[PDB]
Amino acid sequence: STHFDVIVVGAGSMGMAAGYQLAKQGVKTLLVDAFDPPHTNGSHHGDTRIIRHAYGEGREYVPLALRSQELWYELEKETHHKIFTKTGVLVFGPKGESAFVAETMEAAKEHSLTVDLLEGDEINKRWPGITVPENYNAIFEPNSGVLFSENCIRAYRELAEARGAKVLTHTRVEDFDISPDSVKIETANGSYTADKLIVSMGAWNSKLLSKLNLDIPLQPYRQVVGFFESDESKYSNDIDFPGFMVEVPNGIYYGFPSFGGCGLKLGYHTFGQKIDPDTINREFGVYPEDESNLRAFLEEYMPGANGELKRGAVCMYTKTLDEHFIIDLHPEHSNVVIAAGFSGHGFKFSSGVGEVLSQLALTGKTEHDISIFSINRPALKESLQ
Numbered sequence: 281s282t283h284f285d286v287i288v289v290g291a292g293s294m295g296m297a298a299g300y301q302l303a304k305q306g307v308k309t310l311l312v313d314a315f316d317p318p319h320t321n322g323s324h325h326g327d328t329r330i331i332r333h334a335y336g337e338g339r340e341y342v343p344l345a346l347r348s349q350e351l352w353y354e355l356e357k358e359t360h361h362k363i364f365t366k367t368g369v370l371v372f373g374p375k376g377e378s379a380f381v382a383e384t385m386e387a388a389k390e391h392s393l394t395v396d397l398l399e400g401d402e403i404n405k406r407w408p409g410i411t412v413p414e415n416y417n418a419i420f421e422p423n424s425g426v427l428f429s430e431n432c433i434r435a436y437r438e439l440a441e442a443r444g445a446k447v448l449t450h451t452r453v454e455d456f457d458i459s460p461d462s463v464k465i466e467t468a469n470g471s472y473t474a475d476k477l478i479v480s481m482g483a484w485n486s487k488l489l490s491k492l493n494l495d496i497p498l499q500p501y502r503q504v505v506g507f508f509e510s511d512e513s514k515y516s517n518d519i520d521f522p523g524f525m526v527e528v529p530n531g532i533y534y535g536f537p538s539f540g541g542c543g544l545k546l547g548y549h550t551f552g553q554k555i556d557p558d559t560i561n562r563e564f565g566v567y568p569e570d571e572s573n574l575r576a577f578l579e580e581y582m583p584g585a586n587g588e589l590k591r592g593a594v595c596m597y598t599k600t601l602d603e604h605f606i607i608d609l610h611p612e613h614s615n616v617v618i619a620a621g622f623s624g625h626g627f628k629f630s631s632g633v634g635e636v637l638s639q640l641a642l643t644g645k646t647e648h649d650i651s652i653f654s655i656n657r658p659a660l661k662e663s664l665q
């Protein structure tokens with residue numbers, strides 16, 4: 281009995297941001313989620329998320345990163361929940377041996393971002409607790425930082441609902457019915473219709489986009505993080521230890537300073553187990569690599585942050601073949617918007633993406649340049665059934 285202007289399927293990082301953007305404009309919105317966001321079954325838990333501006337994955341992401349940062353600052357002012365702490369973000373790697381570090385540096389130069397360049401012993405001196413070989417160089421971004429992801433989704437949800445958005449929890453959408461002038465979703469708790477549909481199911485996009493006649497390579501990965509007892513006089517946010525994303529011979533790692541003594545948090549970025557979101561084992565430590573891959577990095581580069589394991593979390597990345605996102609209208613339905621394949625680095629952009637999705641759903645276009653995220657790009661290997 282209830283039609284909506286817009287229906288968002290998957291009220292996580294991207295969906296809830298979109299919900300907020302829509303609700304703020306008086307758009308009657310329905311957000312449907314398989315669980316109760318924020319939760320620990322998707323890709324947004326683990327408390328914290330790094331936001332960087334100078335972007336190693338590609339300088340073309342800078343504009344969206346900057347807009348997102350501005351939106352995070354706006355969110356901070358609108359809710360009592362803590363949103364962002366300006367820890368700054370350190371990026372380092374072997375000199376001349378990191379495409380990631382190099383592109384971060386080019387991105388900063390190209391967009392005139394404020395950064396500090398340092399190398400070798402200067403890194404170890406500036407941040408006691410970090411020990412890199414002398415042949416390593418680095419780019420530090422002072423105005424970047426850490427987002428409290430669960431808080432962000434919780435805030436966006438509370439603000440959206442206050443404005444009329446309805447959130448249907450513990451309801452898994454199982455199928456879609458799209459027509460030229462309307463959209464409909466089917467769930468065990470009933471079906472709903474609207475004029476526009478936003479699809480942002482995270483890791484489940486890899487299993488349910490086929491219901492929209494889409495055939496796109498999307499691989500879900502099991503990615504763990506660990507919190508370790510650390511020397512607080514070196515690794516605390518209070519003594520300015522930074523957030524970081526770095527490249528070493530065996531891959532990329534990312535981490536966060538200890539907040540309120542909860543311990544330095546670390547994650548191994550380039551390796552994870554290929555999994556299915558409905559059968560993934562979400563218990564930290566069941567694979568020996570869960571903990572050993574982390575200590576292998578800590579004992580070598582941040583030796584004072586390699587104490588007892590205080591906490592572990594298991595979460596998922598959803599990768600595209602080129603590791604760039606998918607943000608676009610469905611190729612056969614201009615009334616359907618797709619947000620997928622964030623490949624492990626999309627949370628920092630969720631505020632901006634919420635704005636893009638809102639624009640795409642309401643006008644079929646967006647003021648942002650989102651060409652690099654086209655669902656029709658060849659590197660994606662997109663197809664229909």
Ligand SMILES: *Cc1cc2c(cc1C)nc1c(=O)[nH]c(=O)nc-1n2C[C@H](O)[C@H](O)[C@H](O)COP(=O)(O)OP(=O)(O)OC[C@H]1O[C@@H](n2cnc3c(N)ncnc32)[C@H](O)[C@@H]1O
Pocket residue numbers: 289290291292293294295312313314315317321322323324326328329330331451452453454480481482483484488503504505534547594595596597619620622623624625626627628629
């Ligand atoms: C996992 C991970 C990711 C990560 C990170 C560390 C880890 C361990 N660190 C990051 C960082 O420092 N900086 C950054 O920018 N990103 C970082 N990431 C990646 C980021 O967290 C992910 O890209 C992001 O969270 C992706 O968001 P998305 O909105 O795609 O995924 P979600 O938050 O999981 O939300 C999806 C929601 O949809 C629901 N769902 C699923 N299936 C259904 C059905 N059938 N019906 C209805 N709802 C459905 C889920 O329940 C979920 O809430």
Ligand SMILES: [Cl-]
Pocket residue numbers: 323596597598599621622623624625626
């Ligand atoms: Cl992801």
Ligand SMILES: [Te]
Pocket residue numbers: 540541542543
């Ligand atoms: Te703690």
